[PDB]
Amino acid sequence: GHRVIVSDVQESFIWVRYKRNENQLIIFADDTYPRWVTTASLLDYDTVAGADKFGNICVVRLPPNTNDEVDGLLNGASQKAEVIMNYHVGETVLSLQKTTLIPGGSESLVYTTLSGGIGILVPFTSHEDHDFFQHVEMHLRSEHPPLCGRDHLSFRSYYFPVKNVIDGDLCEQFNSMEPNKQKNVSEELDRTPPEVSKKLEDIRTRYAF
Amino acid sequence: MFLYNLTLQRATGISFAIHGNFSGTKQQEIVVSRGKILELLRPDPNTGKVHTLLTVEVFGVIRSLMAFRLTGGTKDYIVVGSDSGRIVILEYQPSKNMFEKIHQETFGKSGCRRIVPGQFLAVDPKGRAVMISAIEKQKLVYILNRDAAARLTISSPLEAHKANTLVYHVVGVDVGFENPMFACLEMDYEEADNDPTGEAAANTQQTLTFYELDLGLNHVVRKYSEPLEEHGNFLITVPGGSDGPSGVLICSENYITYKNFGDQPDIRCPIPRRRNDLDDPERGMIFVCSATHKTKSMFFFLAQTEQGDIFKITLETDEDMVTEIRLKYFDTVPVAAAMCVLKTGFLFVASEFGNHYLYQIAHLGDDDEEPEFSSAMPLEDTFFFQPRPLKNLVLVDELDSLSPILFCQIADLANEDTPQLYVACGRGPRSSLRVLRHGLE
Amino acid sequence: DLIFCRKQAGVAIGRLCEKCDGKCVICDSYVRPCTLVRICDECNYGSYQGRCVICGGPGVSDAYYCKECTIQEKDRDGCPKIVNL
Amino acid sequence: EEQKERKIMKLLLKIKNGTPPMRKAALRQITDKAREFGAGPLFNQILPLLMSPTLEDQERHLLVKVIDRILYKLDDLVRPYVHKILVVIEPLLIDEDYYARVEGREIISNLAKAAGLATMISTMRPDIDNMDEYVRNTTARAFAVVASALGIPSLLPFLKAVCKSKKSWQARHTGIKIVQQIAILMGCAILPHLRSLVEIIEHGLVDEQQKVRTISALAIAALAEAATPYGIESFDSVLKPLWKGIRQHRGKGLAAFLKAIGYLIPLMDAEYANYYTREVMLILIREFQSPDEEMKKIVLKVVKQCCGTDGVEANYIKTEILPPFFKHFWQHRMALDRRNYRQLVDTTVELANKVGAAEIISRIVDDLKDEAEQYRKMVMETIEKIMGNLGAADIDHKLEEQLIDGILYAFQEQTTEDSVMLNGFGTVVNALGKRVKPYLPQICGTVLWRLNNKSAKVRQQAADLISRTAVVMKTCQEEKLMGHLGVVLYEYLGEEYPEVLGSILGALKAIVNVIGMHKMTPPIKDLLPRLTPILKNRHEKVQENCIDLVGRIADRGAEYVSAREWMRICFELLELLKAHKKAIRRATVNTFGYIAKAIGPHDVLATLLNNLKVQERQNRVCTTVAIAIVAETCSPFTVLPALMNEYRVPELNVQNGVLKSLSFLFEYIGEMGKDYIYAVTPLLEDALMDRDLVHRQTASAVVQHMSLGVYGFGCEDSLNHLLNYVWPNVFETSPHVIQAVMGALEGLRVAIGPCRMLQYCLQGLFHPARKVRDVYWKIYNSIYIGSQDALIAHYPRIYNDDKNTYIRYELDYIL
Amino acid sequence: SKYIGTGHADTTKWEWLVNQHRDSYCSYMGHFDLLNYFAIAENESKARVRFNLMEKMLQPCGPPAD
Amino acid sequence: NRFTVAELKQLVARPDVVEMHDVTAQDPKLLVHLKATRNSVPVPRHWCFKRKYLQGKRGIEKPPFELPDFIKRDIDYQKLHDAFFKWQTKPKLTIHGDLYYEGKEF
RNA sequence: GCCGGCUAAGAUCAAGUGUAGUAUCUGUUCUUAUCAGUUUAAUAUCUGAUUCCUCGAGGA
Ligand SMILES: CC[C@H](O)[C@@H](C)[C@H]1O[C@@H]1C[C@@](C)(O)/C=C/C=C(\C)[C@H]1OC(=O)C[C@H](O)CC[C@@](C)(O)[C@@H](OC(=O)N2CCN(C3CCCCCC3)CC2)/C=C/[C@@H]1C
Ligand SMILES: [Zn+2]
Ligand SMILES: [Zn+2]
Ligand SMILES: [Zn+2]
């Protein structure tokens, strides 16, 4: 309602305010990274989700200090925005949209890819779920490595290091391991394989199908 | 803020496709590559349906995919070159329904790099050597062997580096259990970086280079190198040994050339054009993919142009020498990234964008009235043909593919309660607007 | 004259002696060995078949890169055998 | 001038006793020089030096490489000398040194490639018909090498001609030997030419000469061994003659034919494999009674090969093969025969692997009680191999009783301490498991009698047995005379022999590790003060076992000894982190972790800081390692405040120790450090603003380890903040400081990303001063070699000038 | 120095820019979805875009100075 | 055959980034253009100094180390652990381009 | 450091001591000057040329 978000072909995001009574468009914030933006989506009054030509998704948020009423420090704008999320998808995203997919479910961020893929990014609501899924990802990175010789953490850090994303496509490969390795993985999380499978299915059915 | 990523619908675009006996039985399967997904398909010879058997996320970028088989074996392997600095060899396990990694060999740093190999992958037709190559100076060769338990052994790599060199394509050459050979389309740019006039940039030719691996002496040597008439795209292995001559087909702009080392002259055939074409007259014509079909009696090729026209290429031969190249118009299908000709008479078409197709090859041989072009025919001026609807092929199956998705909106535009996905996808005259709903039909 | 070989590494496994057993060949760390060391064919031949990659004594166990060197992809250079001229 | 070229080609001494750079320089120059020097002088001088009686291995390797390179260039000028070279290097192919053989084969291969096939054949043909058997072997091996170099079809006509020679049987013999050597040398690469070779050599099996038949059978066996598991259609014209011959021949030729049969059987189907086995089996059963021992070895090999196929089933084997096998081969005469002893053991194990363990095990277990101990050790070896490969499932009450009684009687009737009876006892008890309840009293009595006395070489073997069997000893719910054994092992703690003390400590540890500290007889407050003086022993096994025992005690029985003694023990263990051996260090780390977890971090940390303040270098480094261990076992939350309080001391050499400890702490804890980066940031700021060089070097090391420790965990804010303080040190001339700065920069390249590093390098890449340009291009090359691909998305836009186009237009496309 | 694409205190603008153009073209050839983007943008087959990039590999940024 | 400061200031889009030595570079136009990129912190400013990066003035004599507030408020159980992780605050941090130099502490 | 300066702001050339390494100390001198070349981001450095006053002496 109040602000304007601009996407540059090579710079990431510019924040502008329209002065209704002065008839002025003033730049009051920008970013510190070059991004080849393909699409953008507003998440709330301060946060923007962006996509890239090189296959990355990022979330950028204004610091709470941010002053809207303006009338460079890096040859740019005086105030900067912080990057709170970085993820390499592996395919070029051209659509981002916040929506609820199932009746009586929760809101997720649905993205779309140039290869015909569809995916979601969903938020965690508690620290326990986040910690459990983080440990699952850690243990599956070592005992179930990618098939063609790639490092999983290095692949999701292709252009920028990963920040605050858990790869649920690596995590659901637990259901396709052999029972011996499923037991070796599950007994480190202090759990049985059926409980891990149920916990994996719960977060998926909470948001998507 | 902490996020969890989930995939709802995997990618359906195909980059590479190979076929072979990957389960060890007599039926044939296809292995297709998505960007980061590997997938095994099996078309049913009774109904013509294509079923997906296995699909695995590899968490990388697949750049080259080959199949090979050792002498005396009944099972095909899979060689993958990716954006890692490793070459991998895989084996399908039908009883476990998974891909088992056989070998891993590390040779360089990760990423899609200029001089680290992984873009080009060639294999010896008898299965005793494999070559991995970058776009620049570095090339590596691995020798493949077998122990007494019939397991695959890999050797240490042999280097074939050559500075200031660009590679367009590499293929293995079919010799008769002689020393393995590899052919490369190469270009040297050293002279072009030293001439400020800009005349060394022009007047620079592609070469066709042959690399011979001497298994007795264990080294790779440059044997032959010849400059070409114009710049060509990919190469085609001609079946040799006791069934066919042993050379290469060079696909180029407006031409296709046969070449072999020795006393064999060069044979050129111009690519026919459509009669009363409506396209800009300044544009040339290239081939975009090819498919070989070898039979115990004869062989032929299937090449497709940018307009989507498949021609059937045969080779008129002598005891050892080739005398003519003959081209004949076969059919028109969408532009494909890969084509696989299957025994039991099926053609699989994986398009660059949109749905993929499986065709039944209905008419074997060629009993027809349409003209057959040749390299022996004199022309001052080019050949012309008339495109027509399908005559040699019948459509049996169609696999849906959302690639490329260009715009999406999630909304309840009908008066259900669940929202639908409205997807503007496709390119050219094959674009469409698709409505997606969660459920079964 | 402490220089690495830096030749194309083959299928031969690097070896460490009783004095260097826990060491990393590149950074000399002792924490978290992660990746098995490979050496070229001229470093693994004849009398050179089993030898410490750091010093050159009789090998007793496998040489490893540390997790820190593996993260930075320092295991992707050539043969890490210390050679003196 | 002639010696002109000689004096200048002393290049080979330039290489032989020379430096590696001039080695390769003279190599290249002599390669360029070879064609003009001429093969005459070059070989006239090199072949003597290669014939030198005391040349080295790698000198020989370099000489062979020189030969290879000077042979590649001069190709068709080597012909008039080929013969000569061969007489020098036709030996080295039957040499007992493997690498000598490899070098000779490489030399002959490069010689055959340099010359032609006709030349090699013309020089090698006169020695085909020689009478000296020493020449006909090197000739065949050299012909095999030439076939491997120039290809098999290039030699196929000469072969087809030479083994049809009606002139003499020596030529035919040598041709068939050439085929055999080709098979032996090339292996599974002969498969496309298998039928050609077989039809070339097949007519020799029916020759009038007996030496030709034998060599033909040996060549068939070699081809079949090279072909496995492929190729049976190519062996079809040999099945009739081979079996008719094994039916009619007798002796050496019979042995050759039987070897051929045995190598051919595993290639067939069930029908043919089953049908052919019956025939060769009646013949082999007849041949069981042979006095010759070579014949026995061949018969054993053929039995093992045929009994391992699918066409032969266990019924026919137990009905026809087992009675004569066990009646003729199992006598102590086989035991003193060292040649076929291992063959008999392997054949019997592989028989049991198909027919079933029970029958074999019975038939030989009745023989465990015997007057000869050689026959006892043989049976024990076979039994424990079968037990380890299959187990004791179908072993029943009678067989279990017999096994136990036999192994017990064999244990006591032992002259010299051997590993055979030890391993047999161990694996038998371990395979029986919870089934041996009363033989547990029996075995305990036996080991008590063996451990009581007799020279401590029986006592250390008894201690090894206890150490390897205590698990099944206690898991059968028995603990009392377990304590009776532990009491005696305790009394056997003062021993002059360290080897026996190691086994005693191992047995004691295996006991206390498997029985609970609960309800167990020998008190810990008695064992541990008796145990602490042994930690200063200098034997490796004693040290390792003592440290492991103290670690187990501290892990489970920590509440039985005062904390002061634990403090003394840990302060003594501090010195063992310098051990030259890896197992000592591993056990010391484990035990220190246990003691720290037991007595608490506070007091040990205070003592470790005091010790870090006052000692020499190595002890301070070990103290740093100990602080890192304490902080990892007890969360670094308990160590960091006390360590940061020590940086507050206004005195150098104390702050530097704190910085070294923080460096190693972060390097050691890795991923656990993500919760502690905010706490150490102001201290690193202070240390990076300091004038002292060691301060900044160590702070850079800390930054590097912290960066590589947290990666993918979202700690980029503090790392960018710290980079703002690390970067001004790039203009430092001191080598150690700049080395640490480069390490920290390459760690931040991973943790923070290459985009930030390129942003820091851009303005200096083209500075007017050459110093700035040198430094910045070094940093940029380090950033470029790692992650060259990511930089594609980060490069800044550069505008076109009048002459050149610099905009990348494809990235400006907008779909 | 042995790695192609590295620089030094005497590197010029032209060498830097042709190095980044050349590895940009190689990165386009490698990544499957960037080539898709370009082939949709300029309405060409992917084989044609690949061949055009390979042809541009030879002399990007024009011929050198003086 | 080299620019002057005022002459090069007339050619560039951003003249306030031009400095004394910038006219003495091998390619001043690229140097000034990279000095104007919308990022890319500048050089540490003491390359031309002659005092080895440590100023011997400004009275650096001061308190050794002031621990954070969370430092002050067995030795402490899991309850004081709870205290140390409830009291833990984020310290003052400088953003991407704020390089340190000898003077900027007072 | 003290209230612009009091020559502790730099370079250099010989010798001593000593370390695995960094180093530490003494004599010094410091062009007080100009031009040309080398060179340095610029200095620097190096390479060459260049009647008088006072009370037998000194300075320029
Ligand atoms: C500045 C430090 C010094 O350089 C010091 C390490 C060393 O230079 C001295 C010389 C000398 C001989 O006195 C000591 C050398 C080395 C040691 C004491 C190391 O221990 C050994 O050699 C034994 C062996 O190599 C393995 C020891 C081990 C497993 O504890 C090793 O550390 C590890 O592998 N860790 C520590 C980290 N830890 C965590 C736990 C979670 C998952 C695994 C990784 C992270 C896993 C186990 C290092 C220990 C000593 C420093
Ligand atoms: Zn390392
Ligand atoms: Zn060593
Ligand atoms: Zn090496």
Can you describe what's shown?
It is classed as splicing. Keywords: U2 snRNP, PRP5, SF3B1, Splicing. The entry is titled "The cryo-EM structure of the human 17S U2 snRNP". The structure is cut from a larger assembly and holds two copies of chain A, one copy of chain C (85 residues), one copy of chain D (815 residues), one copy of chain E (66 residues) and one copy of chain F (106 residues). Chain A has 209 residues and is α+β, with helices and mostly antiparallel strands. In chain A, 23% of the residues lie in helices and 33% in strands. In chain A, strands 4-5-6-7 form a four-stranded antiparallel sheet, with no helix packed on it. Chain A has a three-stranded antiparallel sheet with strand order 1-2-3, with no helix packed on it. In chain A, strand 9 and strand 10 form a beta hairpin. Chain A starts with a strand and ends with a helix. In chain C, the strands form four sheets. Chain C has a two-stranded antiparallel ribbon with strand order 1-8. The longest helix of chain C is centred in the C-terminal third of the chain and has 5 residues. Chain C starts with a strand and ends with a strand. By secondary structure, chain E is mainly alpha-helical. Chain E has three helices and no strands. Chains in contact: A-B, A-D, A-E, A-F, B-C, B-D, B-E, C-D, D-E, D-F. At the A-B interface, strand 7, strand 8, strand 9, strand 10 and helix 2 of A face strand 1, strand 8, strand 9, strand 34 and strand 35 of B. Strand 11 of chain A pairs parallel with strand 1 of chain B, so a sheet runs across the interface. The structure holds ligand 9B0 and zinc ion (3 copies). The structure holds one RNA strand of 60 nucleotides.
**What structural category arises from helix and sheet content of chain C?**
mainly beta
Q: How would you sum up the global shape of chain A? A: elongated
Q: How many structural units, i.e. domains of chain C?
A: 1
Beta-strand residue percentage of chain C? 15-25%
What is the string of helix and strand elements of chain C? EEEEEEEHE
End-to-end distance of chain C: 6 Å
Number of helices of chain C: 1
Taken from the alpha-carbon principal axes, the silhouette of chain C is globular
Following the backbone from N to C, one meets helices and strands of chain A in this order, namely EEEEEEEEEEHHEHHH
Please provide the count of β strands of chain A: 11
Please give the alpha-carbon distance between the first and last residues of chain A: 33 Å
Radius of gyration of chain C (Å): 12 Å
Oligomer: part of a larger assembly
What is the number of beta strands of chain C? 8
Biggest chain contact: A-B, 54 and 55 residues
Any chance you could write out the topology, listing elements then pairs?
The structure is cut from a larger assembly and holds 2 copies of chain A, 1 copy of chain C (85 residues), 1 copy of chain D (815 residues), 1 copy of chain E (66 residues) and 1 copy of chain F (106 residues).
Chain A: E1 3-7, E2 13-19, E3 24-30, E4 37-42, E5 47-52, E6 56-61, E7 82-88, E8 93-100, E9 107-113, E10 118-123, H1 127-143, H2 152-155, E11 165-167, H3 168-171, H4 179-186, H5 193-207
Antiparallel strand pairs in A: 1-2, 2-3, 4-5, 5-6, 6-7, 8-9, 9-10
Chain C: E1 3-4, E2 12-13, E3 15-16, E4 33-36, E5 38-39, E6 61-62, E7 64-66, H1 67-71, E8 82-83
Antiparallel strand pairs in C: 1-8, 2-5, 3-6, 4-7
Chain F: H1 5-11, H2 28-34, H3 69-72, H4 78-86
Bound molecules: ligand 9B0 and zinc ion (3 copies).
The structure holds one RNA strand of 60 nucleotides.
